[PDB]
PDB file of C-alpha atoms and ligand atoms in Angstrom:
ATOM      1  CA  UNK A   1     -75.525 -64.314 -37.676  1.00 36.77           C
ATOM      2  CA  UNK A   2     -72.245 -62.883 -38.435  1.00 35.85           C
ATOM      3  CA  UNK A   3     -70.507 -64.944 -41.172  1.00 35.77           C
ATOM      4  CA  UNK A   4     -66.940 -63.579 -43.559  1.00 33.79           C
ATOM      5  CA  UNK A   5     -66.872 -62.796 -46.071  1.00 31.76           C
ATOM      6  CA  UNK A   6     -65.359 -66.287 -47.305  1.00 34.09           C
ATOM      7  CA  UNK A   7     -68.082 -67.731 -45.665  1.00 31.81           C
ATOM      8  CA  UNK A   8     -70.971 -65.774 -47.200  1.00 33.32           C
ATOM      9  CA  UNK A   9     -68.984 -66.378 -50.443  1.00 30.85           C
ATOM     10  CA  UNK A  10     -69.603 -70.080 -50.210  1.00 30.37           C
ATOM     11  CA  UNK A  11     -73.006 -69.862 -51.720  1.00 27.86           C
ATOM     12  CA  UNK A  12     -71.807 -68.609 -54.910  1.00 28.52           C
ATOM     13  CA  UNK A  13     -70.848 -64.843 -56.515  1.00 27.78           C
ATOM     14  CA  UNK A  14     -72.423 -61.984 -54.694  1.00 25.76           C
ATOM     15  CA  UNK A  15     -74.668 -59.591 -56.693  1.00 25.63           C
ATOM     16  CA  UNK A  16     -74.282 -55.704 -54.816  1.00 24.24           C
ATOM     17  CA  UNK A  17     -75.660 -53.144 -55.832  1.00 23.13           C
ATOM     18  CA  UNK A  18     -74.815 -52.870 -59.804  1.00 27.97           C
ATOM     19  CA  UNK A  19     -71.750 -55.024 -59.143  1.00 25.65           C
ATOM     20  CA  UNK A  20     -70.896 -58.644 -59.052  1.00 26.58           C
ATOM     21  CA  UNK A  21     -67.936 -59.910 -56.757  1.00 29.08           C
ATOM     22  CA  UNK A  22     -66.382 -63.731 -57.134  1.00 24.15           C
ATOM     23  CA  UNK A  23     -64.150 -64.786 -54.499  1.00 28.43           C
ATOM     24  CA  UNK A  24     -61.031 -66.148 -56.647  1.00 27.54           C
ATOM     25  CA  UNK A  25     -59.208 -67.315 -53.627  1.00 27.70           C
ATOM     26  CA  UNK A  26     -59.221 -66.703 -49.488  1.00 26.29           C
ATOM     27  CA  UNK A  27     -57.809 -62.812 -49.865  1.00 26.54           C
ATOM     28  CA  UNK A  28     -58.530 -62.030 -53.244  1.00 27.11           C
ATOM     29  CA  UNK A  29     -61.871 -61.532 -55.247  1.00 27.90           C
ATOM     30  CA  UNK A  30     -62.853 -60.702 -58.743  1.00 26.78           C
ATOM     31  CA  UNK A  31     -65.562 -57.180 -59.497  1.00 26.04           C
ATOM     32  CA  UNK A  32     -67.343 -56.926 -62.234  1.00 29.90           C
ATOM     33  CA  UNK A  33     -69.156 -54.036 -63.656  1.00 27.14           C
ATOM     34  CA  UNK A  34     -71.081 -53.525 -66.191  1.00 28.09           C
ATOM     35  CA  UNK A  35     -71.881 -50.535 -69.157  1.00 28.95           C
ATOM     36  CA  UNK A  36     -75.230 -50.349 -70.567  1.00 31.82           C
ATOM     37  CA  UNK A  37     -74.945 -50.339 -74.294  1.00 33.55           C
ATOM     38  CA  UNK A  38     -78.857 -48.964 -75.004  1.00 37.51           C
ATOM     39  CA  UNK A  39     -80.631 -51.573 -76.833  1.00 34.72           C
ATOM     40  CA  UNK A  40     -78.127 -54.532 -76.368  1.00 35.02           C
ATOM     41  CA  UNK A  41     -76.412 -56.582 -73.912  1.00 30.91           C
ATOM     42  CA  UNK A  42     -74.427 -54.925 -71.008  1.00 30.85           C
ATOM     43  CA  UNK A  43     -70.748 -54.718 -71.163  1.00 31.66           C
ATOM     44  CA  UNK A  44     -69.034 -56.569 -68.548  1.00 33.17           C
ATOM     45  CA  UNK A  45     -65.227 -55.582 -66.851  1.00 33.66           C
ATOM     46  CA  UNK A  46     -63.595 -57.123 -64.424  1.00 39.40           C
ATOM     47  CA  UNK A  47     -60.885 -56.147 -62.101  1.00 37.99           C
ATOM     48  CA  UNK A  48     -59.468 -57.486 -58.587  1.00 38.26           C
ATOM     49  CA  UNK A  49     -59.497 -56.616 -54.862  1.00 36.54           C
ATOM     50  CA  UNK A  50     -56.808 -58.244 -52.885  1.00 36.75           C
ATOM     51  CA  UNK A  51     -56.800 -58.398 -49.040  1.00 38.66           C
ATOM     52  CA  UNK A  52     -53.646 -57.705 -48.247  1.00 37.83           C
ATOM     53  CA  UNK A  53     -52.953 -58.231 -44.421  1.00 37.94           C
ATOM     54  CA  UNK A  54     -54.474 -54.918 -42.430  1.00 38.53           C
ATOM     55  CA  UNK A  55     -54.956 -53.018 -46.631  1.00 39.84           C
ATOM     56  CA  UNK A  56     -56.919 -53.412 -49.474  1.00 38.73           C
ATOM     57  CA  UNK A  57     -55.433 -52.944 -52.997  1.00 37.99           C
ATOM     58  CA  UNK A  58     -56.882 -52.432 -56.371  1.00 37.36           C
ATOM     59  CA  UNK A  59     -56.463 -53.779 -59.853  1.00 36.83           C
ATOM     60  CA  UNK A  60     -58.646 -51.469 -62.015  1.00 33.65           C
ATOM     61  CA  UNK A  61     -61.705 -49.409 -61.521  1.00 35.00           C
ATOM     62  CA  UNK A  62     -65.133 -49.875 -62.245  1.00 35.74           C
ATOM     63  CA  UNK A  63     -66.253 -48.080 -66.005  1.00 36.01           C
ATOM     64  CA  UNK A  64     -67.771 -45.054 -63.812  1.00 36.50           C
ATOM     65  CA  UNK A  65     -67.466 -43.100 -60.335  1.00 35.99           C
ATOM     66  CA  UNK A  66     -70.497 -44.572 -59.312  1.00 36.07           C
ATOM     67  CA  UNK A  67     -69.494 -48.033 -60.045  1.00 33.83           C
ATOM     68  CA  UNK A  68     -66.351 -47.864 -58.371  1.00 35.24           C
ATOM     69  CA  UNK A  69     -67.878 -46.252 -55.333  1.00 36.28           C
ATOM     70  CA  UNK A  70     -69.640 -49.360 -55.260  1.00 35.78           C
ATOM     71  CA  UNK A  71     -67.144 -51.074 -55.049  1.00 35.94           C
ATOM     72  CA  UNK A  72     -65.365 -49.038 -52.033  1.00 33.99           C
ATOM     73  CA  UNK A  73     -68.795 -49.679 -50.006  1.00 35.23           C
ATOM     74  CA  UNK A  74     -68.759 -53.629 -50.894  1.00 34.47           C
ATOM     75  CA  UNK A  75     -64.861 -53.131 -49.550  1.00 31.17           C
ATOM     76  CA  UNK A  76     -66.349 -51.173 -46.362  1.00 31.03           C
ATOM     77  CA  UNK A  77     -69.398 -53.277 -46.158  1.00 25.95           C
ATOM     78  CA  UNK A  78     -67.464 -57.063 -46.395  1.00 27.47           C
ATOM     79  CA  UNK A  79     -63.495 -56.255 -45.663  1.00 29.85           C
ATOM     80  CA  UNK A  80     -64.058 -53.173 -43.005  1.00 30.45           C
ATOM     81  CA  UNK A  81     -60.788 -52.307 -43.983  1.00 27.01           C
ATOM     82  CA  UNK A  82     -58.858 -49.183 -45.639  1.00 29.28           C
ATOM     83  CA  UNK A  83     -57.951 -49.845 -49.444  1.00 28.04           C
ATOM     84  CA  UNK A  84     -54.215 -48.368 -49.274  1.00 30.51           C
ATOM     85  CA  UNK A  85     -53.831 -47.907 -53.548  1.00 29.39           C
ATOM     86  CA  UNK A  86     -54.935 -49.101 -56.905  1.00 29.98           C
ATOM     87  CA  UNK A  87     -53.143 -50.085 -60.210  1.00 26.14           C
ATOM     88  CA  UNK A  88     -55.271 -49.262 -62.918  1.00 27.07           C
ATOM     89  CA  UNK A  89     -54.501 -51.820 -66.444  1.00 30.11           C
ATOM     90  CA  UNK A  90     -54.378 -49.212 -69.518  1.00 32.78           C
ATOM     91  CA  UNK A  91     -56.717 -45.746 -70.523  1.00 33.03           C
ATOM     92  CA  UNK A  92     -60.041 -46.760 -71.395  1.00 32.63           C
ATOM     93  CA  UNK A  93     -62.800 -46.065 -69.876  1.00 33.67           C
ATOM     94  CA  UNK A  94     -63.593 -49.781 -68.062  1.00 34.22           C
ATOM     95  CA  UNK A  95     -60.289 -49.881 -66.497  1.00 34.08           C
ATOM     96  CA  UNK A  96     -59.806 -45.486 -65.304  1.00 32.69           C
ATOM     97  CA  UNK A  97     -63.048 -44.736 -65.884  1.00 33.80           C
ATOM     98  CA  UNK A  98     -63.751 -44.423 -61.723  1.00 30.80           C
ATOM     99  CA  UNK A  99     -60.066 -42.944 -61.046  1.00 34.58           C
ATOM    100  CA  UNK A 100     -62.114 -39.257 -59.536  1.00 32.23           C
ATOM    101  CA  UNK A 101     -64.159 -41.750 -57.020  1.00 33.27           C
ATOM    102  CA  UNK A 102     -60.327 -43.680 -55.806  1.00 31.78           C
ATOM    103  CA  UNK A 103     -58.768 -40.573 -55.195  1.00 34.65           C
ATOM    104  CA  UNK A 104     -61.638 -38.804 -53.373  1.00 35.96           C
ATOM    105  CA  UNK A 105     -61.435 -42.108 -50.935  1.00 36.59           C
ATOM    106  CA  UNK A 106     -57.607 -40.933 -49.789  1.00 38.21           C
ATOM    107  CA  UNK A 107     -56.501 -44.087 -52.203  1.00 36.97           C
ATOM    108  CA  UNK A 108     -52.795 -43.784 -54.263  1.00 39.48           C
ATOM    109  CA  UNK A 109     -53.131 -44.511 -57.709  1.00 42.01           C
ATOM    110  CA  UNK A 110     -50.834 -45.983 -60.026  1.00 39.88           C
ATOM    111  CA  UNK A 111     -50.752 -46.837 -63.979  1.00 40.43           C
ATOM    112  CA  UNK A 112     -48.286 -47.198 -66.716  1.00 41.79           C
ATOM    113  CA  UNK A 113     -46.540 -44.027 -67.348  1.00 42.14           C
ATOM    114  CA  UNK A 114     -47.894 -44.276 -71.204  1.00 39.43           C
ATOM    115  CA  UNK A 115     -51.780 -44.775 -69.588  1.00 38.79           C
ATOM    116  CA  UNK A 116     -51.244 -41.427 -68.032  1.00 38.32           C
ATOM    117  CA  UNK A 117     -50.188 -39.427 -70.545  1.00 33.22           C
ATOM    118  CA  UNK A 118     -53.582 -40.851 -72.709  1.00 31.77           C
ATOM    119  CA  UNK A 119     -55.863 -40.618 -70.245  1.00 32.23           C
ATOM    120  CA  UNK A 120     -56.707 -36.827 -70.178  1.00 35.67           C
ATOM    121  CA  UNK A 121     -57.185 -36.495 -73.818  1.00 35.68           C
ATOM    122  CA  UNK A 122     -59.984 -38.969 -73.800  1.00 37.66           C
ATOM    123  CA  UNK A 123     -61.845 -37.017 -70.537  1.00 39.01           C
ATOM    124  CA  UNK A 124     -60.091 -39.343 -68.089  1.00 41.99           C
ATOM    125  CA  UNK A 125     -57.988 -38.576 -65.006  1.00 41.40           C
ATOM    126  CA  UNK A 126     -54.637 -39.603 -64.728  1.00 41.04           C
ATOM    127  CA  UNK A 127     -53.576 -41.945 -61.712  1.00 41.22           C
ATOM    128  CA  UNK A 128     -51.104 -39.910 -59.491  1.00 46.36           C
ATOM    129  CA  UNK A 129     -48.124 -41.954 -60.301  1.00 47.12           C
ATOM    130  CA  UNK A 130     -46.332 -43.069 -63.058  1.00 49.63           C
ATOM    131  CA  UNK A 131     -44.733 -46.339 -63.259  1.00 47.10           C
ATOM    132  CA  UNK A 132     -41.872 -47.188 -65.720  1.00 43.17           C
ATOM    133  CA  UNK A 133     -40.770 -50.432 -66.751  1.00 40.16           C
ATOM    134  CA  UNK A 134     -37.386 -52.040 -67.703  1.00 37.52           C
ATOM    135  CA  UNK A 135     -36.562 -53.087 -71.662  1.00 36.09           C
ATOM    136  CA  UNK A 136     -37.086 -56.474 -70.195  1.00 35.40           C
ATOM    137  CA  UNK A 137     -41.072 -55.348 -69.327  1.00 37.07           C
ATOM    138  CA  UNK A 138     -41.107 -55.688 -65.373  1.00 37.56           C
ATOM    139  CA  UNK A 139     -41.536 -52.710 -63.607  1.00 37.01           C
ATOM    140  CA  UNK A 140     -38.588 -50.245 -61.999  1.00 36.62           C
ATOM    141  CA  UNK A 141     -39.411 -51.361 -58.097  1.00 40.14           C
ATOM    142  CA  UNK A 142     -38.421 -47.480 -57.482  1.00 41.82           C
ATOM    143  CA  UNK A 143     -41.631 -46.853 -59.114  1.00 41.15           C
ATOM    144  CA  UNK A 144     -43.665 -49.549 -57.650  1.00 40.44           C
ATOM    145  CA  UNK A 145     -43.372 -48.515 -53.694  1.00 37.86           C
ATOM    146  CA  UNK A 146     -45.236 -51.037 -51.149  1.00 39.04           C
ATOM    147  CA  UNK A 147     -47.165 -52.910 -53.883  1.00 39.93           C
ATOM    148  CA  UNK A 148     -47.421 -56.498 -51.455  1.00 41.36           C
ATOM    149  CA  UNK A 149     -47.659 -59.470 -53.135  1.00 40.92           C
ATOM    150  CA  UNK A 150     -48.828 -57.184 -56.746  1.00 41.04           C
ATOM    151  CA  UNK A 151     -46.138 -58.126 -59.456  1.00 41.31           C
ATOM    152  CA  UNK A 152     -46.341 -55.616 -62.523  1.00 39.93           C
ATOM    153  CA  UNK A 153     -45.049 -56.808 -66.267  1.00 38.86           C
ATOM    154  CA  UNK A 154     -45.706 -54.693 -69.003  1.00 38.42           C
ATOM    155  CA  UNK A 155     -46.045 -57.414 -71.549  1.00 41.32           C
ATOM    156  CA  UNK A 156     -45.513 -55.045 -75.169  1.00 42.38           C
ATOM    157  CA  UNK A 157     -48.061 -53.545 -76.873  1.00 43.12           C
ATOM    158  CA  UNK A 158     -51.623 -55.499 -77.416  1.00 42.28           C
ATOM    159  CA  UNK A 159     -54.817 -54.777 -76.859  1.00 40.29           C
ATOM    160  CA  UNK A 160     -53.797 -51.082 -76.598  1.00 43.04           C
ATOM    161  CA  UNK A 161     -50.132 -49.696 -76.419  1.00 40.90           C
ATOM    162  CA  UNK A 162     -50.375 -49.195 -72.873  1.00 41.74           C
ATOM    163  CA  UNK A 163     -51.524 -52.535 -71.482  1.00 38.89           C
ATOM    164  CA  UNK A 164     -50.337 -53.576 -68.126  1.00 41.16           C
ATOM    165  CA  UNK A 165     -50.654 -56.646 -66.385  1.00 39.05           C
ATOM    166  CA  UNK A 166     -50.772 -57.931 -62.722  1.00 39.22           C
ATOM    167  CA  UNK A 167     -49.404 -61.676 -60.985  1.00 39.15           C
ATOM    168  CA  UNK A 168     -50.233 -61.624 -57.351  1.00 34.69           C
ATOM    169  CA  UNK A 169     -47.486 -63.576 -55.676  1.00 34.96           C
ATOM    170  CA  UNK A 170     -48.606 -65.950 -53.119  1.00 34.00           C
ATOM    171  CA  UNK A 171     -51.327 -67.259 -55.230  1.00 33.67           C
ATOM    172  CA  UNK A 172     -51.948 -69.057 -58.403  1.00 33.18           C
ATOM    173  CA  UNK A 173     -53.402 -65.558 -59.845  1.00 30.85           C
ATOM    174  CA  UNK A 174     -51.997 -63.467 -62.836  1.00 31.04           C
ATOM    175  CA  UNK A 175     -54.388 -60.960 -64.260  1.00 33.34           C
ATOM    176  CA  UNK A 176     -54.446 -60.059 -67.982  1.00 30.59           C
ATOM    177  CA  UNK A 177     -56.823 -57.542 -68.115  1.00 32.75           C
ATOM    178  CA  UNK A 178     -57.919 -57.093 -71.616  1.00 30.85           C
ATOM    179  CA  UNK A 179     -55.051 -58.576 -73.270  1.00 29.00           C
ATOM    180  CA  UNK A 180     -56.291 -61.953 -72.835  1.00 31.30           C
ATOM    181  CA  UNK A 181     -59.551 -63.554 -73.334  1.00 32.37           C
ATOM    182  CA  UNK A 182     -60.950 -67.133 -72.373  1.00 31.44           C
ATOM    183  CA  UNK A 183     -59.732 -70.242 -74.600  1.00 31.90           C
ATOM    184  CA  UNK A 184     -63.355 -70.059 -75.785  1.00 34.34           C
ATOM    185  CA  UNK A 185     -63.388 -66.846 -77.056  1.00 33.65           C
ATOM    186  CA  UNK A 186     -65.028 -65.864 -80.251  1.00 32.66           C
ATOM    187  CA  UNK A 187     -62.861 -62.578 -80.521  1.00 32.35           C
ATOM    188  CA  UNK A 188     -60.592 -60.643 -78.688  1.00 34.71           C
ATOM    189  CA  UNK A 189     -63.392 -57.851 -78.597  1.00 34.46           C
ATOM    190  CA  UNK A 190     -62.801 -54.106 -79.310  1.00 36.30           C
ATOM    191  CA  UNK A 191     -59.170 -53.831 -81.589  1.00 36.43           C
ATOM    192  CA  UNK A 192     -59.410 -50.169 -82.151  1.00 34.30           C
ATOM    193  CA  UNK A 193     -56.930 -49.223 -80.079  1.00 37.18           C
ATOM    194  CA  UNK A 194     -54.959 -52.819 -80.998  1.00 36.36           C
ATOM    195  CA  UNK A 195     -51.106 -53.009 -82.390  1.00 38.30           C
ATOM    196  CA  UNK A 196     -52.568 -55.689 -84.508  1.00 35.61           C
ATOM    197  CA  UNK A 197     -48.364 -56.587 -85.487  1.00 37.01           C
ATOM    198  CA  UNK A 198     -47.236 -57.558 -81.964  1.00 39.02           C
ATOM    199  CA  UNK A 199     -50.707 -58.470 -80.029  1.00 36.82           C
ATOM    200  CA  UNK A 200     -49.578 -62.010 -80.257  1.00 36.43           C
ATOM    201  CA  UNK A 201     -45.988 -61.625 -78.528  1.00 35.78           C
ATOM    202  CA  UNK A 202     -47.268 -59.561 -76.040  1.00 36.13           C
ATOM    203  CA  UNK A 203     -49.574 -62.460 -74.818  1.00 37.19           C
ATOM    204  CA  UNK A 204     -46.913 -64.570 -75.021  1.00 39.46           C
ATOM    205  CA  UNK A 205     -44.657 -62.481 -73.050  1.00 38.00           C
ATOM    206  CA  UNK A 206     -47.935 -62.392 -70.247  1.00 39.40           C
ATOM    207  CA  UNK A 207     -47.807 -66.010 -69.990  1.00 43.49           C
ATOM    208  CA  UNK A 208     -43.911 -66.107 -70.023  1.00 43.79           C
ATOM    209  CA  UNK A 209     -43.662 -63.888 -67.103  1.00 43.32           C
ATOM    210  CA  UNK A 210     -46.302 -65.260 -64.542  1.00 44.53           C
ATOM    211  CA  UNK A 211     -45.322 -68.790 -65.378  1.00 49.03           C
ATOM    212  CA  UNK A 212     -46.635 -70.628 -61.993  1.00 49.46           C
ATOM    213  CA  UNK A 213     -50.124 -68.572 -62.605  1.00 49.60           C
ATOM    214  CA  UNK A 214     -52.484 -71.486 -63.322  1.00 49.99           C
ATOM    215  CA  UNK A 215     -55.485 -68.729 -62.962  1.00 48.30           C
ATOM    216  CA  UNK A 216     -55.609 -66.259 -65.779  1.00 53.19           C
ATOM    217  CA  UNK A 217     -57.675 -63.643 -64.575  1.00 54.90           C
ATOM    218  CA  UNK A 218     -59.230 -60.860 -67.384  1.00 54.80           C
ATOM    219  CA  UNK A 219     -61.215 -58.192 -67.906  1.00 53.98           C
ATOM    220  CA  UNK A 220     -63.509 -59.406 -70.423  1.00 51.98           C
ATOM    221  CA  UNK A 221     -64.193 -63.000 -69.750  1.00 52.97           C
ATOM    222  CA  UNK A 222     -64.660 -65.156 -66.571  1.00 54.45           C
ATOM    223  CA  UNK A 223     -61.346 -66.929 -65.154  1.00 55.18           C
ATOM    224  CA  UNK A 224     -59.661 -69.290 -67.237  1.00 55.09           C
ATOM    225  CA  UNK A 225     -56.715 -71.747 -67.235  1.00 54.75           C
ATOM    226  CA  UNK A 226     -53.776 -71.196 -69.110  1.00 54.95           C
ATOM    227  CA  UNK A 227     -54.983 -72.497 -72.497  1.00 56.45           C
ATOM    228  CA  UNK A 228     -56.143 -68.780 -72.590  1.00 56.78           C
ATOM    229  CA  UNK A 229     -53.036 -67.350 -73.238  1.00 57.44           C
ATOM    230  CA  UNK A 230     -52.187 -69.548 -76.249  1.00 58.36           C
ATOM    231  CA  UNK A 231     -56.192 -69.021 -77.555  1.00 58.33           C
ATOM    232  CA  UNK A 232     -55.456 -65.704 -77.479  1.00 58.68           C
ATOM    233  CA  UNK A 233     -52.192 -65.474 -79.297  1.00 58.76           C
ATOM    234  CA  UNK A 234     -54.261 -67.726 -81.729  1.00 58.14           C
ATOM    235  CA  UNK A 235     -56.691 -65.703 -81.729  1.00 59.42           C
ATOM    236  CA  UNK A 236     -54.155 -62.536 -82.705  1.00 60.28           C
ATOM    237  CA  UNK A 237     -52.094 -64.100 -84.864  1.00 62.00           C
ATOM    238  CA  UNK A 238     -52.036 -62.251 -88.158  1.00 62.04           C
ATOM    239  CA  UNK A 239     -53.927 -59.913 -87.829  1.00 61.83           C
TER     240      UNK A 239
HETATM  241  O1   OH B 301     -61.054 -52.212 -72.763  1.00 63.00           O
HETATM  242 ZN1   ZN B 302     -59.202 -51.668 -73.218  1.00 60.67          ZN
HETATM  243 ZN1   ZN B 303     -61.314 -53.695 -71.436  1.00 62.18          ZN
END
């Protein structure tokens, strides 16, 4: 009995190891990891593997090098094929905190120019290249080589300065990362590192940029239509 991957992922999301994967649509799934907070509730991320002809790409490690091993042998296990690079969403610790275990695998990383320069600081790696984006938030192409169908808009600052976010053209997919949270959303979790003055813009610019995305994908809540965005931006306003 030798089913796909889409057809194993019929029955539902697909616990592995400490991981869960979601198929989101026929080349693209949703992992989510999880941090132990010691005495409460584990801390769930999610980020995206997209199948992308004979290569795998990346949106975002796992919070650890374990965890995002993991997630290279669910890729090795389920795709059986080679995962070509990775874009990882801003510098904290649930979207670079697995960069060592991506670059040990051969993969090319790639993050906001900003999320490199604050990742070592906080006893993170940096991913190997640097993107830059125009005034108008899209990225330079010349710093984007052979991304596929991976669109990347930085949106202004949010949820952290550095925020990035992902459309994968092709599909009805945009992914958010932590800028965005579900239109149920009781908060818009962990501000620390917020610009608490523009976090409402910069989800507005999200949802201006990926327009045909009817799928918001994000880090911190489960797939959502657009009503998201707007939540959020509710959700921000003021603060
Ligand atoms: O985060
Ligand atoms: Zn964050
Ligand atoms: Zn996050």
């Amino acid at each position: 009995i030798r089913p796909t991957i889409g057809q194993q992922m019929e029955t539902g999301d697909q616990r592995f190891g400490d991981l869960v994967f979601r198929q989101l649509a026929p080349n693209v799934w949703q992992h989510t990891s999880y941090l132990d907070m010691p005495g409460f509730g584990a801390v769930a991320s999610n980020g995206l593997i997209v199948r992308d002809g004979g290569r795998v790409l990346v949106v975002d490690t796992a919070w650890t090098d374990d965890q995002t091993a993991q997630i290279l042998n669910w890729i090795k296990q389920e795709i059986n094929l080679p995962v070509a690079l990775a874009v990882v969403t801003h510098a904290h610790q649930d979207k670079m905190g697995g960069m060592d275990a991506l670059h040990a695998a051969g993969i090319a990383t790639y993050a906001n120019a900003l999320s490199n320069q604050l990742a070592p600081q906080e006893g993170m790696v940096a991913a190997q290249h640097s993107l830059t984006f125009a005034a108008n938030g899209w990225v330079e192409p010349a710093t984007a080589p052979n991304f596929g169908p991976l669109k990347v808009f930085y949106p202004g600052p949010g949820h952290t300065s550095d925020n990035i976010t992902v459309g994968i053209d092709g599909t009805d997919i945009a992914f958010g990362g932590c800028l965005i949270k579900d239109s149920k959303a009781k908060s818009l979790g962990n501000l620390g590192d917020a610009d608490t003055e523009h976090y409402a813009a910069s989800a507005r610019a999200f949802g201006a940029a990926f327009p045909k995305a009817s799928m918001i994908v994000m880090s911190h809540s489960a797939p959502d239509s657009r009503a998201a965005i707007t939540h959020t931006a509710r959700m921000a306003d003021k603060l």
